[PDB]
Symmetry: C2
Subunit: 43 residues, 2 copies
Amino acid sequence: KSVVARVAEAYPEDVGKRIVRMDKYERAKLGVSVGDYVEVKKV
Amino acid sequence: KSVVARVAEAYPEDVGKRIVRMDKYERAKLGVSVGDYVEVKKV
Protein backbone atom coordinates (compact mmCIF):
# COMPACT_ATOMS: atom_id res chain seq x y z
CA LYS A 1 0.00 0.00 0.00
CA SER A 2 1.14 3.56 -0.75
CA VAL A 3 -0.27 7.02 -1.44
CA VAL A 4 0.98 10.08 -3.31
CA ALA A 5 0.70 13.54 -1.79
CA ARG A 6 1.87 17.05 -2.55
CA VAL A 7 4.51 18.46 -0.19
CA ALA A 8 3.49 21.63 1.65
CA GLU A 9 5.36 23.73 4.19
CA ALA A 10 5.23 22.74 7.85
CA TYR A 11 3.43 24.63 10.60
CA PRO A 12 6.06 26.76 12.39
CA GLU A 13 5.59 25.00 15.70
CA ASP A 14 6.05 21.65 13.94
CA VAL A 15 9.48 22.55 12.55
CA GLY A 16 12.14 20.07 13.66
CA LYS A 17 9.72 17.45 15.03
CA ARG A 18 10.06 14.91 12.19
CA ILE A 19 6.30 14.69 11.61
CA VAL A 20 4.19 14.58 8.47
CA ARG A 21 0.63 15.99 8.73
CA MET A 22 -1.61 13.68 6.63
CA ASP A 23 -5.39 13.64 6.77
CA LYS A 24 -7.71 10.70 7.38
CA TYR A 25 -8.06 10.03 3.63
CA GLU A 26 -4.32 9.51 3.09
CA ARG A 27 -4.03 7.56 6.36
CA ALA A 28 -6.83 5.22 5.29
CA LYS A 29 -5.10 4.49 1.97
CA LEU A 30 -2.05 3.50 4.03
CA GLY A 31 -3.78 1.74 6.90
CA VAL A 32 -1.81 3.95 9.29
CA SER A 33 -2.93 5.79 12.39
CA VAL A 34 -1.73 9.00 14.00
CA GLY A 35 1.58 8.20 15.69
CA ASP A 36 2.62 5.51 13.19
CA TYR A 37 5.80 5.89 11.14
CA VAL A 38 5.88 6.27 7.36
CA GLU A 39 8.61 6.26 4.76
CA VAL A 40 8.49 9.16 2.28
CA LYS A 41 10.20 9.14 -1.14
CA LYS A 42 10.30 11.61 -4.02
CA VAL A 43 8.08 10.62 -6.98
CA LYS B 1 16.70 8.95 -1.07
CA SER B 2 13.97 8.58 1.56
CA VAL B 3 13.04 9.81 5.04
CA VAL B 4 10.97 8.42 7.89
CA ALA B 5 8.44 10.59 9.70
CA ARG B 6 5.72 10.19 12.30
CA VAL B 7 2.16 10.64 11.04
CA ALA B 8 0.21 13.44 12.74
CA GLU B 9 -3.33 14.68 12.17
CA ALA B 10 -3.97 17.22 9.43
CA TYR B 11 -4.92 20.86 9.95
CA PRO B 12 -8.72 21.08 9.56
CA GLU B 13 -8.52 23.38 6.56
CA ASP B 14 -6.10 20.95 4.90
CA VAL B 15 -8.52 18.01 5.08
CA GLY B 16 -9.21 16.56 1.64
CA LYS B 17 -6.42 18.42 -0.18
CA ARG B 18 -4.02 15.46 -0.59
CA ILE B 19 -1.08 17.32 0.97
CA VAL B 20 1.60 16.28 3.42
CA ARG B 21 3.08 19.04 5.63
CA MET B 22 6.85 18.30 5.93
CA ASP B 23 9.42 20.75 7.21
CA LYS B 24 12.63 21.91 5.55
CA TYR B 25 14.67 19.18 7.29
CA GLU B 26 12.61 16.32 5.83
CA ARG B 27 12.42 18.07 2.44
CA ALA B 28 16.21 18.43 2.34
CA LYS B 29 16.69 14.71 3.03
CA LEU B 30 14.45 14.09 0.01
CA GLY B 31 15.68 16.85 -2.26
CA VAL B 32 12.06 17.95 -2.70
CA SER B 33 10.54 21.40 -2.66
CA VAL B 34 7.13 22.66 -1.64
CA GLY B 35 4.72 21.64 -4.40
CA ASP B 36 6.59 18.47 -5.37
CA TYR B 37 4.93 15.06 -5.11
CA VAL B 38 6.02 12.31 -2.73
CA GLU B 39 5.10 8.68 -2.28
CA VAL B 40 4.29 7.65 1.30
CA LYS B 41 4.39 4.05 2.57
CA LYS B 42 3.85 2.48 5.99
CA VAL B 43 7.08 1.42 7.73
